[PDB]
């Protein structure tokens, strides 16, 4: 509602978000990597890390 923390899951989402902002630029290097599966491969890996860290956080949260 104001600001959040520096949790492992927020940092993971951070990296997903920074990657997507680069993609948004549709530069030449983004265009190369879009026609390969390279970009979808990197985003899937970042997505999975986000949801892994998020599960772990909620689990430890229930301890409080």
């Amino acid at each position: 509602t104001e600001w959040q923390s520096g949790q492992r899951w927020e940092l993971a989402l951070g990296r997903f978000w920074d990657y997507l902002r680069w993609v948004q630029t549709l530069s030449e290097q983004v265009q190369e990597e879009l026609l390969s599966s390279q970009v979808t491969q990197e985003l899937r890996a970042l997505m999975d890390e986000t949801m892994k860290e998020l599960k772990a956080y909620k689990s430890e949260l229930e301890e409080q």
Binding site: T1, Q4, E10, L13, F16, W17, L20, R21, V23, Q24, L26, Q31, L34, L35, S37, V39, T40, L43, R44, M47, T50, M51, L54, Y57, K58, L61, E62, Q64
Partner: protein, 83 residues
Amino acid sequence: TPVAEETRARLSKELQAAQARLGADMEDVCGRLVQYRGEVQAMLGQSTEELRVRLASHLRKLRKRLLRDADDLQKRLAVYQAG
């Protein structure tokens, strides 16, 4: 369970749904970039100028939904933190 018992579980469902929304958002983005890959093959080498303009516009709206659902998830975790 410790900060109002029967209701706190009746609030895990909501947190549950927020995570589902984020996951869905991240998948819709990847889906849209796969679709771009196929659109370019369909064009058989002709200019992809118009495809790139459409993708940019659509990706900005997908990115806005993602941020909104990420914001909502943070706010829900925070309350759960001390139900």
